């Protein structure tokens, strides 16, 4: 089996942890406990191949921006998350993409843009704007809901496929 | 570079040496070290390693007491800030504000990451190893007081969080699925008629499913504390490894029930139907990746009372003999095929816990607790990383839940199975073997005939699910 | 060459695992990882004859009592171990031997009785008691101290000789 190191980044509160735990335990976390640094392991078969996913859940709170570079060097793929009812989180995406590009010193890093919280009806970011940004980066855009599981497997597994073909 | 605090005011500033830390020959991997160095690395400012926190929190009790660990991390957290540099002093001395370039860098690249990491240890400690706090009231009071003394807005988010987590642990998990669970299947016994439940009256598909739910929950309830230190093998095992023992006892009980169902069915033709049904249950276990279930059947088929029933196995259809043989091959050559199979499936699954127990036990007694270097006695951390690697594998398979509906009455039926009755092990074991001799005497004694005991059709409904609801 | 399948049986906590480890492992290496292949095989020379020892040791799995028959049937020789400071483990020997005879369907199975010293606790089974029990069964008695590596090789080599002279 092949191992893949995925990293989930994005502004605080977008649902990086909820997406991760929904994928790992099929459970939705309603509590909001700010992450410092957490890692998860998951054995799964993707496109007929068995693989071991190592998922690093990062801190969104800017009061930990110093540790960032530390996890981007080891990561092979990145899930860049923002919430569709939070314009500032969407605007923070640009910064995460640039840090990753800088650290790993590459303009071809495997990543997926994820618009989380698609179960909520108070949308402030249109699918089209996120889609345009994704195209400008040459990556796919996947909308999800850690609450309903909608699009969750798709986001993580698409990221795995990008690392595999990269 | 960046000047660290004086080693005379902060113990975690002593430089690394062959006397206090050893690395393995791409973050550094610690082979051995003093408790002080282990804690420094546990909360290092340069790189991340969430793998280290779990390993440490899971195994530290053999080389460090809880109270002492708390003292050391609080001491780690209290980092003294550096004195103003020459440029700062010159500014202060002229009545203006210092740029404090170095102080700000030190807070950003050393203090903050170290303090956040200390807090991370505290959160995980309380979150997943609360028993330390349950067993020591003062330990909890000290943690609550430490967390409550932390000042500064650069920590308030995490302080508030941990305080709430601690209170939730003192006061006292829904599951969402992609698809919907398959419809419960019934055979001869109908819903609500628990009195007719038995091996051949319940649907084989539902027997395998309900037992898999049962066995999955037992597996998922085993905590690392029940494994570390090889406590399940010591005199206090019933106290220290209750969930592990509940799981093993269930497996044993089910294996004996299969053996009993077979040898107590004296009529050859009916016994063949019983063996055949059990192999079909095995087939469903394999489809569900319930390896524990698969092995309970294999152990039953390979027990002394059953293994010797040549006349019975001669009538089992060839396709089923192959199924049983493939299952048996998983255990051969020290489970080589099983290990390969487990690493290749798509969970959910229910692993065989036996393998893990043997590996933990050997790792624990095949490695020294400390490594000596220049007279110095260092904590052998590699031994701990190995035990934690095993407990980590176990936990990885404990995450995925099964998408199957529980059937209260069938579950109850299997929870109350008691093949041994009030008889002791030796007596029951001998009873089964004597029954085997009765139904299929040793050669050259002739094979006798026995009357049928079942009043309902013995034809199996098969193991292919039906799709109506 | 000839491969001998040897099974170590006995009550939990008598040091079965330490015996096997002492026989197989490399004694002059800092780390031991039983999670690696061939941690059960060992090529040795006994009385000028080179052979392969395959140790079937399931220490730590004693609670899986219904799996005993299957684990034992594959062995050619058996080490019946007890702890010299545990009278219970000594009294359990009788049934282990009976179970071995039943699974091997033979009244003459190659076996050795092993008294192991696990620690510094007080000895409760004297050598004479063990030698009398061993004599009553017609088998060799060997005392070991896995911790100090005394008598370990002797226990297994004596069993191999018992198999060869069968
Ligand atoms: N309705 C809804 N709420 C969600 C969703 N994902 C997360 N939330 C909620 O949003 C809050 C924050 O989620 P969380 O996973 O902690 O966010 P995070 O990005 O990990 N935060 P941090 O960076 O601080 O660690 C929680 O109350 C959570 O239940 C979603 O898809 N739908
Ligand atoms: Mg989080």
Using CA atoms, how far apart are residues B144 and B465, in angstroms rounded to an integer?
54
Last residue of a domain, one of B380, B396, B412: B396
Token pair recorded at residue A76: 């092979």
Q: What is the helix (H) or strand (E) element at residue C52, kind and residue range?
A: strand C49-56
What whole-number distance in Å separates Cα of residue B166 and Cα of residue B148?
12
- B25, B292, B304, best to mutate vs chain C, most C CBs in 10 Å: B304
Mutate to test the pocket of ligand 1, among A9, A17, A23, A56 (most ligand atoms within 8 A of CB): A17
Host H or E run for residue B271: helix B268-287
* Domain interval for residue B203: 182-353+397-466
Q: Are residues B165 and B307 in the same domain?
A: no
Q: What tokens appear for B68 in the block? A: 């002492």
Question: Which of ligand 1's atoms lies nearest the C-alpha of A14?
Answer: 19
Question: Which chain C residue has the Cα nearest residue B370?
Answer: C30
Kindly state whether residue B150 falls inside one of the protein's structural domains.
yes
- Examine residue B190 and state whether it is found in any structural domain, yes or no: yes
C160: containing domain: 1-166
User: What is chain A's alpha carbon radius of gyration, rounded to the nearest angstrom?
Assistant: 15
- The total number of structural domains in chain B stands at 2
Could you tell me if C152 and C44 are in contact, meaning their C-beta atoms sit under 8 angstroms apart?
no
Check A67 against B344: CB less than 8 A apart.
no
**CB of A97 shorter than 6 A to ligand 1:** no
Instruction: Provide CB contacts within 8 A for B46, sequence distance 6+.
Output: A70
Ligand 2 ion: residues within 5 Å (CB): A 16-17, 35
Chain B environment of A27 (Cβ under 8 Å): 173-176
For this PDB entry, the determination method is X-ray
**Relative to the CA of A120, which ligand 1 atom is closest?**
1
B25 contacts: CB under 8 Å, gap ≥ 6: none
Hey, what are B233's tokens?
A: 């093998």
Examine the domain organization and report whether B389 and B410 are in the same domain.
no
DSSP at A43: E
Is B109 contained in some domain?
yes
Q: Of the bound ligands, which one is closest to the alpha carbon of residue A149?
A: 1
CA nearest B228: which of B371, B352, B378, B394?
Answer: B394
| Any atom of ligand 1 within 6 Å of the Cβ of A115 | no
- What is the side-by-side order of every strand in the sheet holding B376-380? B21-23, B30-33, B376-380, B370-373
| B313-318: long-range pairs with CB below 8 Å, 24+ | B313/B275, B315/B268, B315/B272, B316/B272, B316/B275, B316/B276, B316/B279, B317/B276
What are the residues whose beta carbons fall under 8 Å from the beta carbon of C24, sequence distance 6 or more? C39, C40, C41, C42, C55
Neighbours of B119 (CB within 10 A): 23
Euclidean distance between CA atoms B93 and B86, whole angstroms: 10
Sign of CA dihedral B195, B196, B199, B205: negative
- B382: nearest CB among C31, C67, C102: C31
Nearest to C78 by CA among C112, C128, C44, C35: C112
Question: Which three-class secondary structure string do you get for B389-428?
Answer: HHHHHHHHCCCCCCCCCCCHHHHHHHHCCCCCCCCCHHHH
Q: What is the CA(A31)–ligand 1 centre distance, in A?
A: 8
Q: Which residue of B has its CA nearest to C99?
A: B304
| A39 bridge partner residues | A56
C18–B230 C-beta distance less than 8 A: no
B366 and C95 within 8 Å at the Cβ level: the answer is no
Q: Which residues 6+ apart lie within 8 Å of B427 measured at CB? A: none
Measured torsion, CA atoms of residues C53, C56, C58, C63, in degrees rounded to the nearest 10: -140
Q: Respond yes or no on whether the N-terminal peptide bond of residue B444 is cis (omega within 30° of 0).
A: yes
Overall number of domains in chain A? 1
Q: What is the layout of strands, in order, in the sheet containing C41-46?
A: C41-46, C49-56, C3-9, C77-83, C111-116, C141-144
- B175 occurs within a structural domain: no
Helix B242-263, helix B204-220: angle, nearest 10:
160
CB contact under 8 A, A26 and B400: yes
Other C-beta atoms closer than 10 Å to the C-beta of B107 total 18
φ/ψ (deg, to 5) at B355: -55, -45
| Measured distance CA(A52)–CA(B346) in Å, rounded | 11
Number of inter-chain CB pairs under 8 A, B vs C: 98
- What separation in Å is there between the alpha carbon of A13 and the centre of ligand 1? 5
In eight-state DSSP terms, residue B110 is I
B233 domain residue, yes or no? yes
Q: Which helix (H) or strand (E) holds B53?
A: helix B50-59
DSSP B299-367: HHHTSHHHHT-HHHHHTS-HHHHHHHHHHHHTTHHHHHHHHHHHHHS-S--B--HHHHHHHHHHHHHSS
Q: Where are the beta strands (DSSP E) in chain A?
A: 2-10, 37-46, 49-58, 77-83, 111-116, 141-143
CB of A85 within 6 A of ligand 1: the answer is no
Domain final residue pick, B396, B429, B449: B396
Resolution reading in Å: 2.2
Please tell me which residue of chain C has the smallest CA distance to B248.
C64
Same domain for B113 and B41:
yes
B113·A67 Cβ contact <8 A: yes
Residue B239 lies in a domain: yes
| Domain CATH code at residue B128 | 1.20.870.10
- Residue B451 is assigned to a structural domain of this protein: yes
What backbone torsions phi and psi does residue B384 show, to the nearest 5 degrees?
-70, -40
DSSP state of B230: G
Tell me, what CATH number does C146's domain have? 3.40.50.300
Determine which residue's CA is closest to atom 13 belonging to ligand 1: A15
- Name beta bridge partners: B290: B350
Residues B378 and B444 in one domain: no
DSSP letter string over B133-168? HHH-HHHHHHHHHHHHH--SHHHHHHHHHHHHHHHH
Residues B367 and B423 in one domain: no
b/e sequence B165-185, b meaning 16+ C-beta within 10 Å: bbeeeeeeeeebeeeeeeebb
Residue A118 marked in a binding site: yes
**CA separation (Å) from B445 to A53, B439, B440?**
60, 11, 9
Distance from CA of B48 to the nearest CA of A (A): 6
């Amino acid at each position: 089996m092949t191992e893949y190191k995925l990293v989930v980044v994005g502004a605080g509160g977008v649902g990086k942890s909820a997406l991760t735990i929904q994928l790992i335990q099929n459970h939705f976390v309603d509590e909001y406990d700010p992450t410092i640094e957490d890692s998860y392991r998951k054995q799964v078969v993707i496109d007929g191949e068995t693989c071991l996913l190592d998922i690093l859940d990062t801190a969104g709170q800017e009061e930990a921006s110093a540790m960032r570079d530390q996890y981007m060097r080891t990561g092979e793929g990145f899930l860049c998350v923002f919430a569709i009812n939070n314009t500032k989180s969407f605007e923070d995406i640009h910064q995460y993409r640039e840090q990753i590009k800088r650290v790993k010193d590459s303009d071809d890093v495997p990543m997926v843009l994820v618009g989380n919280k698609c179960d909520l009806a108070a949308r402030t970011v249109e699918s089209r704007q996120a889609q345009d940004l994704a195209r400008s980066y040459g990556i796919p855009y996947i909308e999800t809901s850690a609450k309903t599981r909608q699009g969750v497997e798709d986001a993580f597994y698409t990221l795995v496929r990008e690392i595999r073909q990269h | 570079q960046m000047r660290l605090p004086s080693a005379d005011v902060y113990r975690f500033a002593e430089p690394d040496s062959e006397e206090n830390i050893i690395f393995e020959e791409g973050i550094p991997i610690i082979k051995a070290g003093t408790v002080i160095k282990l804690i420094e690395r546990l909360t290092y400012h340069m790189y991340a390693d969430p793998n280290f926190v779990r390993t440490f929190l899971t195994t530290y009790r053999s080389f460090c007491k809880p109270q002492e660990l708390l003292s050391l991390i609080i001491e780690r957290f209290e980092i003294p800030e550096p004195e103003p540099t020459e440029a700062d002093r010159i500014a202060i001395e002229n009545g203006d504000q210092p740029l404090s370039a170095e102080l700000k860098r030190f807070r950003k690249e050393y203090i903050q990451p170290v303090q956040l990491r200390v807090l991370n240890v505290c959160r995980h400690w309380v979150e997943h190893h609360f028993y330390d706090f349950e067993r020591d009231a003062y330990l909890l009071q000290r943690m609550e007081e430490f967390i409550g003394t932390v000042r500064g807005k650069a920590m308030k988010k995490w302080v508030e969080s941990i305080t709430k987590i601690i209170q939730r642990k003192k006061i006292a998990h829904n599951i969402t699925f992609q698809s919907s669970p398959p419809t419960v299947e019934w055979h001869i016994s109908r819903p609500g008629h628990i009195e007719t439940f038995d091996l051949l009256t319940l649907h084989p598909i539902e027997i395998a499913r309900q037992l898999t739910l049962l066995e999955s929950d037992l597996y998922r309830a085993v905590q690392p504390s029940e494994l570390v230190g090889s406590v399940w093998t010591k005199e206090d095992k019933e106290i220290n490894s209750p969930n592990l023992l509940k799981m093993i006892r269930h497996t044993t009980n089910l294996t004996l029930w299969f053996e009993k169902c077979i040898v107590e069915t004296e009529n050859l033709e009916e016994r063949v139907a019983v063996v055949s049904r059990i192999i079909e249950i095995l087939q469903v276990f394999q489809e569900l990746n319930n390896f524990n279930g698969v092995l309970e059947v294999v152990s039953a088929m390979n027990s002394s009372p059953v293994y010797r029933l040549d006349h019975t196995f001669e009538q089992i259809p060839s396709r089923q003999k192959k199924i049983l043989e493939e299952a048996h091959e998983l255990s051969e050559d020290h489970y080589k095929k099983y290990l390969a199979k487990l690493r290749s499936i798509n969970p959910p699954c229910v692993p065989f816990f036996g393998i893990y127990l043997t590996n933990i036990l050997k790792t624990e007694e095949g490695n020294p607790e400390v490594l000596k270097r220049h007279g110095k006695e260092l904590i052998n951390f590699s031994k701990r990383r190995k035990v934690a690697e095993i407990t980590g594998e176990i936990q990885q398979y404990q995450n995925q839940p099964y998408c199957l509906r529980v059937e209260s009455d069938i579950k109850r039926f299997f929870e109350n199975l008691n093949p041994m009755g009030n008889s002791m092990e030796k007596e029951f074991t001998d009873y089964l073997f004597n029954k085997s001799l009765e139904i299929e005497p040793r050669n050259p004694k002739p094979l006798p005939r026995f009357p049928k005991k079942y009043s309902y059709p013995l034809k199996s409904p098969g193991v292919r699910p039906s799709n109506p609801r």
